Design a protein around this ligand. Structure first.
Ligand SMILES: Nc1ncnc2c1ncn2[C@@H]1O[C@H](COP(=O)(O)OP(=O)(O)O)[C@@H](O)[C@H]1O
Ligand SMILES: Nc1ncnc2c1ncn2[C@@H]1O[C@H](COP(=O)(O)OP(=O)(O)O)[C@@H](O)[C@H]1O
Ligand SMILES: [Mg+2]
Ligand SMILES: [Zn+2]
Lengths: 302, 22
């Protein structure tokens, strides 16, 4: 009902937060801001941010450099940052199993090193999704942080990442303690609404409808709760405005905005306005978060 | 697609093999 996320902060029981959607809408700018708000409010705890998107752009939002290992933000000590890549797992592995792999391939070729060089250049499809799951599991095991925030990649990939543990436990248990229990506990938490939650981001256009419906349907399957959604790139103009451009775009948005409210009225829908400049630096973040707790005052508001 | 199928088998093996790392 209320267009805000204030109900999220009060529930300290949360452990996993997600932010997903299409590209070019503010998945990164939104996630990073929400984390800062939760940290300054709970200074006696730890918090972690993490990026699973290959187009790592968090460093450009904070104006600070980050690496493949967890670091600390200069502006605040409570918060930490991190970004996962695929050029470190292979680097650390740099084989024993790969060698045996060739033997299996050569075998069938008969019944029907040089390959090591292929490992150098990489270019192995799916490696980004495979190695990423490995890194998280190592970080998920540690129990020093309280919660974790994710800046996920497009929906086309984040879903396949969520289904991975459900299939690994299946084949593992079908072919077969510390490892299986870890993953089993993880999939258990991602499904409980009191611990996990998924949030969406979109813009007032036509493609938002089809994408949002497909997203919710695929989440209800996995039994994951979607309790809210975020809209961005909104204009605060009206027919009374003299600028023809600002007037035309507004009429195009008042249409789709009303549609979404009627369908998912049960969800917490929030509206974020458009800003003059970009969002770079802690200065602009703490101002972007105020719109998520206390709603902005638009022209048509009352 | 025949040789590519072997490549598909080569890539399909990496997926199954990488599972042991878990
Ligand atoms: N409210 C906003 N008004 C204007 N530009 C914005 C706003 N929020 C984000 N942007 C910018 O839009 C671009 C896309 O958003 P960004 O946060 O980079 O995420 P993504 O890369 O997932 O689209 C970036 O340049 C970002 O800084
Ligand atoms: N010149 C333009 N002015 C305004 N909106 C545009 C313009 N060109 C494309 N769009 C719209 O911007 C969105 C993104 O562009 P689109 O052609 O869909 O490609 P992509 O999905 O790769 O971003 C779509 O809604 C598209 O129709
Ligand atoms: Mg991004
Ligand atoms: Zn104007």
């Amino acid at each position: 009902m209320l267009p805000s996320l204030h109900d999220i902060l009060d529930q300290h029981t949360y452990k996993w937060i997600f932010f997903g959607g299409k590209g070019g809408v503010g998945k990164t700018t939104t996630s990073s801001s929400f984390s800062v708000l939760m940290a300054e409010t709970r200074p006696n705890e730890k918090f972690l941010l993490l990026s699973t998107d290959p187009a790592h752009n968090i460093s450009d939002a904070f104006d600070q450099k980050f690496g493949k290992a967890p670091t600390q933000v200069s502006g605040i000590p409570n918060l930490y940052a991190m970004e996962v890549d695929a050029s470190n797992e292979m680097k650390s592995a740099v084989x024993x199993x790969x060698x045996x792999x060739x033997x299996x391939x050569x075998x069938x070729x008969x019944x029907x090193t040089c390959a090591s060089s292929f490992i150098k250049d990489g270019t192995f499809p799916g490696m980004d999704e495979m190695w990423s799951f490995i890194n998280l599991i190592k970080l998920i095991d540690t129990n020093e942080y309280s919660t974790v925030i994710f800046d996920t990649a497009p929906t086309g990939h984040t879903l396949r990442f969520l289904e991975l543990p459900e299939t690994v436990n299946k084949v593992l248990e079908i072919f077969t303690y510390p490892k299986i229990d870890v993953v089993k506990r993880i999939s258990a938490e991602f499904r409980d609404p009191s611990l996990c939650t998924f949030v969406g981001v979109c813009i007032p256009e036509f493609l938002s409808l089809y994408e949002t419906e497909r997203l919710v349907q695929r989440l209800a399957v996995l039994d994951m709760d979607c309790h809210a959604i975020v809209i961005n790139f909104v204009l605060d103009a009206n027919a009374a405005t003299p600028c023809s451009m600002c007037r035309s775009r507004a009429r195009m948005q008042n249409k789709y905005i009303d549609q979404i409210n009627e369908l998912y009225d049960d969800f917490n829908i929030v509206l974020s306005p458009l800003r003059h400049d970009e969002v770079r630096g802690i200065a602009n973040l703490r101002d972007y978060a105020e719109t998520l707790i206390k709603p902005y005052r638009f022209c048509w508001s009352a | 697609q025949k040789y590519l199928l072997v490549f598909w088998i080569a890539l399909i093996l990496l997926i199954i093999g990488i599972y042991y790392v878990l």
